[PDB]
């Protein structure tokens, strides 16, 4: 974990760099967004497991349950967008200028 918690953390930052620099398809962000939730879920589960802190295992899952719906909302917005613009491409999302 000393260096196994640095890989996961950098994974979250590499996923951070991803969600923040868009490119074309919006799905790739959402998908990326999810890459973080996995990294957070893995790190939370890892430390809870090596702290033998069983009282906290509820959290690793609450994180996933909330993250799943969060993503559900995200995809419905995505479907709504390629119903209004025929694509998920972000450039289209420039009307509010």
């Amino acid at each position: 974990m000393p260096s196994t918690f640095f890989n996961l953390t950098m994974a979250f930052s590499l996923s951070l760099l991803g969600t923040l620099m868009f490119r074309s398809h919006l799905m790739s962000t959402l998908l990326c967004l999810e890459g973080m939730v996995l990294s957070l879920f893995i790190m939370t589960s890892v430390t809870s497991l090596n702290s033998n802190s069983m009282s906290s295992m509820p959290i690793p899952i609450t994180i996933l349950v909330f993250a799943a719906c969060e993503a559900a909302v995200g995809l419905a917005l995505l479907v709504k967008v390629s119903n209004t613009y025929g694509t998920d491409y972000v450039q289209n999302l420039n009307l509010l200028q």
């Binding site: 962000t29 957070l40 809870s48 959290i59 969060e70 909302v73 995200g74 917005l77 009307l95 200028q97």
Partner: protein
């Protein structure tokens, strides 16, 4: 909306901030933030106009990544202290993350780009909720953790917001976006005093809520998203011209009205704490905010813009009244100043 759905959503949009405030286990504070994100998105696309889908998809991505960053801070803390909550010992970077993240959900400073755009594509009503019952949640999390956050960053985000809000507002002519910009600014003052006297943040918020809620129900009484639209207020409903005038000058800091107190006591508290550098620059550009407020004053009240013949038709018909809240929140806001000592 099937009234049942309306209830579930509205309950969530309301259980969302309330769980955040009540809980101490940060995790439970995070899901309170998460529920607010999920509940607001359905209402945002109610018209389902092409502009709306854009609004929600931006609001959601901005909100979601910030939510993930807030969770990372809680996850990191869990390994630097077994506790699920920030403590004196917390690594400084851990707290700064929470500031940036929470300053994105609240939309302060260099993350102020999403708010003006989502405020532009959502209805006036959902505009209010997106501006004022969604700021309570994140601010609660910050106010709780104030003893630990950095005085430097907050100040920079504070000053930046004040400037960005002011400068942005000067050019805007769409009302929804003028308000979005004002909110960025006021939000700035609020976060300036958080490290020093959180109790004043809660005043600079309430007053902002007691000022903005009447102002928006005014914009929608005639549902005018344009200044030109609010300028013909004199024909559509003449009485609100008087209070719209005072509330907007109250939103800016002019001295007789209630709006001065938040700026005055924040400046008094910052000078008490010696930031006479920071406080001075903030107050000065705060004066820029009044310029765009008064430019609107000019169009809506002090000068009468030309109207359309078809307006005579709308006069004939009885005007659906403004709720009582307008009055009670217009007066308590435009003139409570004589009662400042007890407010603070």
């Amino acid at each position: 909306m099937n009234p049942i759905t309306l209830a579930i959503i509205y309950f969530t949009i309301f259980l969302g901030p309330v769980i955040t405030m009540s809980s101490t286990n940060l995790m439970l504070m995070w899901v309170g933030l998460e529920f607010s994100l999920l509940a607001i998105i359905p209402m945002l696309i109610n018209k389902k106009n092409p502009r709306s889908t854009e609004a929600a998809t931006k609001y959601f991505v901005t909100q979601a990544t910030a939510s993930m960053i807030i969770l990372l801070a809680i996850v990191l803390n869990y390994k630097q202290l077994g506790t699920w909550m920030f403590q004196q010992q917390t690594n400084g970077l851990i707290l700064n993350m929470t500031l940036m993240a929470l300053s994105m959900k609240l939309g302060l400073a260099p993350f102020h780009f999403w708010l003006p755009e989502v405020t532009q594509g959502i209805p006036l009503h959902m505009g209010l909720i997106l501006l004022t019952w969604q700021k309570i949640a994140p601010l609660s999390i910050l106010i709780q953790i104030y003893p630990l956050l950095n005085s430097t960053i907050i100040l920079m985000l504070a000053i930046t917001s004040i400037f960005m809000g002011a400068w942005g507002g000067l050019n805007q002519t769409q009302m929804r976006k003028i308000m979005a910009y004002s909110s960025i600014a006021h939000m700035g003052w609020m976060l300036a005093i958080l490290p020093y006297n959180p109790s004043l943040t809660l005043l600079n918020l309430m007053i902002y809520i007691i000022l903005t809620a009447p102002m928006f129900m005014a914009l929608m009484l005639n549902n005018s998203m344009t200044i030109n639209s609010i300028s013909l207020l004199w024909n559509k409903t003449p009485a609100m011209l008087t209070m719209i005038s005072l509330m907007l000058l109250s939103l800016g800091g002019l001295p007789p009205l209630t709006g001065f107190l938040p700026k005055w006591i924040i400046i008094t508290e910052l000078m008490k704490n010696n930031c006479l550098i920071m406080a001075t620059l903030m107050a000065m550009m705060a004066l820029l905010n009044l310029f765009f407020y008064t430019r609107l004053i000019y169009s809506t009240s002090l000068t009468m813009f030309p109207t359309n013949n078809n307006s005579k038709m709308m006069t004939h018909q009885t005007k659906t009244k403004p709720n009582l809240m307008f009055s009670t929140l217009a007066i308590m806001s435009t003139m409570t100043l004589p009662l400042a000592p007890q407010l603070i």
